[PDB]
Symmetry: D2
Subunit: 386 residues, 4 copies
């Protein structure tokens, strides 16, 4: 049951199943994976494609011949499996040069390098067919207040993204950017810490249409925020270009659990929203198989990502299609929420005694919203307890 196929558009980063298990208190628990092997194993599980940071595919410091060979082998794996590469990104966080940032490093020479590194990989992303180029500015931020003037850093961040937009447009590329928020970790505070901050920033870029967000479940939950609500605001803005799916337990370090783990009900409401909104992008998993696992456990955890999406998709669809739930949604006035407040216009509102002098506030206040009955229908559907 709940068997994924490539038509489900499930994608995985190389760095997900390839995570060796190092952590700040721990050494690797797994050997490195060849990207060719992860392409093959993901395909066999029913994935649609893979994504990469530059340095996941090509070791940092490679010669041009080494680079060609890594890319050749990867392309052969993609061709052998039918896997796609819908998204790529830059690693602007691992190398010590990026310890104060890439695009917002205090050192100008590092900012210029970060841009050159990114632009080299945009070209490769396009080679490989990617439609989206993600940017997670994990090193952009500070541990102390004097270290980083945030106005100046936002000026630098805008320059960087505007240069990248100039570049793609100069080359005639179709690729679009997706900025990935995170509130903290590895920096004490990261710039553009939530979906909202990233959306706001994009509106000040010179070509805003080229940029959207890549929200990650666990990242918004590291700020205690409602991930489905943030996704709804990104969809409302027309900016959900890509998404990272995983699990998180609240406010703590970035756990990157498999999707469905962590906050299960938020996963249900997320799937419900993506499906009802007709989101057409990749269902991408940015997760890490726990370091307790061997390779068999890596593949089990990846399979579980997809399985849980498909279970939740079935249950959300059944919820929305249930006449009893449709009834309950009307009883809770979700239909009224979707109608304009004052399509009659401002003057008409001002002249409507039913809106003020003759509004019976107590009668309106007495009306229950019937939200608990609706929510228990939702729970019953999620649990298969109807």
């Amino acid at each position: 049951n709940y068997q994924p196929t490539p038509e489900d558009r499930f994608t995985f980063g190389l760095w997900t199943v390839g995570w060796q298990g190092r952590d700040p208190f721990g050494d690797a628990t797994r050997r490195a994976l060849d990207p060719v092997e992860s392409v093959q194993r993901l395909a066999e599980l029913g994935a649609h494609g893979v994504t990469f940071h530059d340095d996941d595919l090509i070791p940092f410091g490679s010669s041009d011949s080494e680079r060609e060979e890594h890319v050749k082998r990867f392309r052969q794996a993609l061709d052998d499996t039918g896997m796609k590469v819908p998204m790529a990104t830059t690693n602007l966080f691992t190398h010590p040069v990026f310890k104060d940032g890439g695009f917002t490093a205090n050192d100008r020479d590092v900012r210029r390098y970060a841009l050159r590194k990114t632009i080299r990989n945009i070209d490769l992303a396009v080679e490989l067919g990617a439609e989206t180029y993600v940017a997670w500015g994990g090193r952009e931020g500070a541990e102390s207040g004097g270290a980083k003037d945030v106005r100046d850093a936002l000026d630098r961040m805008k320059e960087a993204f505007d240069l990248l937009g100039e570049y793609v447009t100069s080359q005639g590329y179709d690729i679009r950017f997706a900025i990935e928020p995170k509130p903290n970790e590895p920096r004490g505070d990261i710039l553009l810490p939530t979906v909202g901050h990233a959306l706001a920033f994009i509106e000040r870029l010179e070509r805003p249409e080229l940029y959207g967000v890549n929200p990650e479940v666990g990242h918004e939950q590291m700020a205690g925020l409602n991930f489905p609500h943030g996704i709804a605001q990104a969809l409302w803005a027309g900016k959900l270009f890509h998404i990272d799916l995983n699990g998180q337990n609240g406010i703590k370090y970035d756990q990157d659990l498999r999707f469905g783990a962590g906050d299960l009900r938020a996963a249900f409401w997320l799937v419900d929203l993506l499906e009802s909104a007709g989101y057409s992008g990749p269902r991408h998993f940015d997760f890490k198989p726990p370091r307790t696992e061997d390779f068999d456990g890596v593949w089990a955890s990846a399979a579980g990502c997809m399985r849980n999406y498909l279970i939740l998709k079935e249950r959300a669809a059944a919820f929305r299609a249930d006449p009893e739930v449709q009834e309950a949604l009307r009883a809770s006035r979700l239909d009224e929420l979707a109608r304009p407040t004052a399509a009659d216009g401002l003057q008409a509102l001002l002249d409507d005694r039913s809106a003020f002098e003759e509004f019976d506030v107590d009668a309106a206040a007495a009306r229950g919203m019937a939200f608990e009955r609706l929510d228990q229908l939702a729970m019953d559907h999620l649990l298969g307890a109807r």
Copy 2:
């Protein structure tokens, strides 16, 4: 020492010093205050002005004669003291009619009422000289996923704010709006939960220039965010129209402690930023004297708000003016953060071998940022330990 005067522009809501101490587990511990008495007592402490929700000044349900009389008495107090009213707002949260929201209530008739209530108070705010009209949508949101379609609610929220902008423009008023984020409480999740989400939303209003944010220290800290960073992003966007100053200890219920309490170092960095940026708006306190206090303690806590601002202003100024700190800022490359990354242009960057093929990554990585020395200078200045 650190004596405030009206020229410091310190303001207080009527509902701050007037908070009777009810909480969800507790009855009032203080009698209600007459607004006239709080105007007088605040003036005597050196405040510049006061702010109000409609229902703080005029009891809900008042007749026109009662309303005139409440306003008359308040105006006399303002005239007796020289206090100003720079901001007002609407109470769209206390009355049970607003239990599912004002502007985004599922019930359309409630949304229309909320707008009429607001517009009546805009007129009064303008009467009294207010430059800013705040909106805190504390009831906008949900406890469960099916109860609120956030796309539809954002459509309703945009209609509401666009109608308010149509109204002010129709009347020729100069007043501008400031949306106050909060992530949760009283709703399980509140819409526009952070500065970023509110900034993003404003960009989609029909007349965005009429709207900014009213960030509150404790609200961003309820999401674990860096309040000075969020203020910097609001300043970068040109949208810091007003601010609420108070204290909070992290991620928990909204504490509304006096300013300086809660996160003291964040208070220092906030003041440093407001002063270095030349923020010219009110320094408004949205706080609650703890319910342990009698009226003497109310006034002590209000005085402490202002005192702590003035202490932190002195220390931040001394930090920035210290030649030793100026030196340390250059050593940490804060000067370089403020210069353009690539004013030479994209092509020039692309053709600069110093940015890639001949960039010595290891040499750059070895350079320490010197942030800890800078931060300990900051600590020494804050503590008066230089």
Copy 3:
């Protein structure tokens, strides 16, 4: 399906379904309920019993004749329905006299009053058949550091609980105490903030056997803790005398959602643990129907508490009984976790070369734990997706 009956031992506080919906930003949205009516309505839903604070049953300030009459009517309702009263407690938080605490108020006369108030209600609890007397010290704590010397407050708290133990023993009562932790709200920080702190404190009481804990799902989750783990530690200590069941979304104000709402997977693991451990106490709900609801919604939300417990009980049982899961538990070495590390004794361990000089660390490190496969079996069982 999932129909509760009194044999399931589900209990509710009067203050749960009777919550009028006041909050710190909001007035009541529901009328007060007569305890007689809530007894009747709960019984009809299949509840086993009810619990009370003194002031829920007898208005504060009642005369002896009024008190007798309130108790008479309540007893008639209990007799009419077959409902039980397994637990009672004291309200040491609503009245302004308790603004700095009951048992740890700085004012000694308040501490003495708090004790007298409690002892009066212990007598009534015993009258009504209660086996457990809960104490939630919601006002014990501080908003500022100088206000409360915690060593001195713990001395006062120990005196108070030791006096209560002297009292029950003097009267020959069988009732036992259960201390309910909470980390914050209404105080900035509450004393005994978690299960662990309360367990530790109990060990220093003069008659520790008389005292256990009453952990509440949402309270431990307000500190970001794992509620099932804390329950396991209370069970390990022999101290789970009572429990409060509800839902919470992480680190924020105390939400008191219906059980099953909030962290659904934690609810599953909680039920699994209570049932596998053979917890024999009440399954008590300390929840609040959201203030959006009318009375119909109150009863729906109460019914949902019980329904969700029963669904999760079925799924947890099925998980543990599945041979495939039993296999997976052995593959993950849960059997080995349950065997003694060194029943051979210290000397034997010291002389065992297999434990050190000849332990093959790499071979052991290579063994995967198989936890992800186990967890996806758990997920499949919870969702009814096997």
Copy 4:
């Protein structure tokens, strides 16, 4: 000013100043330090001593000759400087063998190994003069519910600590154990997650007098708890055997900032408590110089730890000695908090009409606590603004 000397008892782990800066998203930014060099540099800053994990001093896997040589060199550095070694600990977290735990690993052979590893290092700790042996069970816990039966794991944890107590007693050693709580990271949830849970656990060990806690500032703050309050409870229990000092900003990953950074007011109240209680143990820093720093910044950050302690010690002493503050403490009834509630005894309390029938609740409720004035005196003292 604020110059530390060895008599201040400041200590540092080798792993603090020696942290190379690896993090889960980042490679090392600093070379490894020779322990000899850190001993020398710490001594020159005015430190009293150093602490170590086994694997900080002796590379994992060393031969007996290599081990002797590492220890010889370290002892020479200690002798050259007069530095002490008051505490040591075991690394039961870095090596992949410990991926599911040391003492509570599911694999029994790993649990036995963990014990042998610890016991070898206890012997060395004693060699070097240590009085305290810390245990931080960072790998004890789980990412999923089925992986770890917490009752069984606590049985294993108790066996392990009881075996260690048998060992020290068999050898006639004076050393005592200190269990270090942490709520999460690297495991999704860690067992014994707070001071309270560890204190409770200790009471169930066979020789409880041999065990205390080693609380860390940032760890309790990762659960949003009040660190000074938790320290007060550990002192009340007689169990503050050691402490880890650092800084943290709330609920997020373990930051390990220098002491004084993070929550500054909590640092002030902590110092106030340690000094007023006469804590006589090491003032140990478990911190990490941020990876932005070079070696000069490492030493600056270490110096700042000590400086901030000494500043806060001066300010706390001045607060407590100020007659004005002494007055304010009496006005807030801190004197009354320290007197017994009912030294007259239970019967006397029961017969005291002033405690109930003739207690004037309203008069008592009207009395303000004067906490805000007290707290602003505290703020003025901290800031040097008296």
